[PDB]
């Protein structure tokens, strides 16, 4: 037999990281206006629309 001593040591370490970000924006605007006026006058009538 062999006399003596055994000394053992260990360090196991890990690391993991994950990040994700999403952002969206959509804007739609519409405007529509149409105008018309007519007018007529002759002896002896009057029309205005």
């Amino acid at each position: 037999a062999v006399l003596g001593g055994i000394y053992e040591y260990t360090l196991v370490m890990n690391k993991e990281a994950m990040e994700r970000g999403d952002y969206t924006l959509n804007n739609v605007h519409a405007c529509a206006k149409n105008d018309f006026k007519i007018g007529g006058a002759i002896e002896e009538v009057y029309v205005s629309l």
Partner: protein
């Protein structure tokens, strides 16, 4: 960690008016009509969760 953000907005408008005046007679005559309308709508909703 979790994060959620939602915001919605809707705007709508409407405006219309009809003005028609017609008067026919032997003597001088006048007919006038005035109509105008306006609509406005605004909606907003926001949500945030962490």
């Amino acid at each position: 960690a979790n994060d959620l953000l939602s915001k919605v907005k809707k705007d709508k408008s409407d405006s219309f008016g009809v003005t028609i005046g017609i008067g026919p007679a032997g003597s001088p005559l006048l007919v006038g009509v005035g109509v105008s309308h306006s609509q406005d709508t605004s909606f907003l909703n926001e949500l945030n969760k962490y």
